[PDB]
Design a protein around this nucleic acid. Sequence first.
RNA 1: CCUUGGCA
RNA 2: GGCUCCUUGGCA
Lengths: 132, 79
Amino acid sequence: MMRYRKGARDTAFLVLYRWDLRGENPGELFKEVVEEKNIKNKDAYEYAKKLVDTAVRHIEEIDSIIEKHLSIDRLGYVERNALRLGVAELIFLKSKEPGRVFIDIVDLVKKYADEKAGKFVNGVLSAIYKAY
Amino acid sequence: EKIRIKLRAYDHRLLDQSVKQIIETVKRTGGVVKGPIPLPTRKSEFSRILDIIRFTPQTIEALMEISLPAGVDVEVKMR
RNA sequence: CCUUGGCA
RNA sequence: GGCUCCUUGGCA
């Protein structure tokens, strides 16, 4: 409760990131990341899958939302897909642990980019949720 | 025959834009890609890894032609 | 040998 | 514990 979700968020971000860069079928890209990370745990696999399937299904509205607090293609690849993942979980999945996703999402950005990127994402993601 | 490429930079947005160009160039020449995998930022340095799992002679030509920003440093290994 | 992370 | 796994850098 609910620690497996941290790794799942990492998985999902990796998929969205490479979907953005490759523009290929998300389902197949998800399979690539799962294999590369060697994910075995059932709940880690299934929550990651739900995260991505959610982000993909609602991609247009998700982007529209983000753009209201900025054009989205101006953002970096790490920033934009972290924001996508966040909006997916907080709003379209109605996370009952919003504090956790903020922490995990912002850490993701700090890990693969830098502090500045992390602060930009946190600040934009906050305005979004606030409105919600 | 495959190719493994690692890119590094001190600017992460420039880095991911570089990775995108390589991917497009590779696909434009009938190549097939795996990744990219982002690595943890270490000492202010961002890095990414990309695998070319299928390539044509055209793919090699284009990769040789491409001029990446000097800030992006490249490491290439066939295998 | 120490260390960033993944698998968790 | 990962001698039955990968990854990053520092040293050496």
